[PDB]
Design a protein around this ligand. Structure first.
Ligand SMILES: Cc1noc(C)c1-c1n[nH]cc1-c1ccncc1
Length: 121
């Protein structure tokens, strides 16, 4: 178990770019990590965004968030070929990064307090 609740991570989910997140406990399972139905480890994360979302993410698609400038190192893992950055998505990503940069300056307990989502049935 590489990550704990409140840890800042980048997550690569679906068609979206590497995205700033916080590890958190699933509101129903009450765990932040599990072994999936294919036998692989996953972590439960919250995406920093103006549109809050959560997901279970394979451990290979989760990375410690050390700072926003790490994005270039993540793009490297994959003439130089670069994907363009769609305007609306870029704007949402910049918002998420601003929150993650603020969270980086907080303690783990402060981050848990400030950002853990409230889930309503
Ligand atoms: C959208 C969306 N909805 O559910 C999930 C999961 C996502 C998602 N996947 N990868 C990144 C995001 C995300 C991007 C922007 N804001 C929040 C979440």
């Amino acid at each position: 178990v590489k990550f704990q609740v409140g840890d800042l991570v980048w997550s690569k989910v679906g068609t979206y770019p590497w995205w700033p997140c916080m590890v958190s406990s699933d509101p129903q399972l009450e765990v932040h990590t599990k072994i999936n139905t294919r036998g692989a480890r996953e972590y439960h994360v919250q995406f920093f965004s103006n549109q809050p979302e959560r997901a279970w993410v394979h451990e290979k698609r989760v990375r410690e968030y050390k700072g926003h400038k790490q994005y270039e190192e993540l793009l490297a893992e994959a003439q130089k070929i670069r994907k363009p950055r769609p305007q609306r998505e870029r704007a949402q990503w910049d918002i998420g990064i601003a929150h993650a940069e603020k969270a980086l300056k907080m303690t783990r307990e402060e981050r848990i307090e400030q950002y853990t989502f409230i889930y309503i049935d």
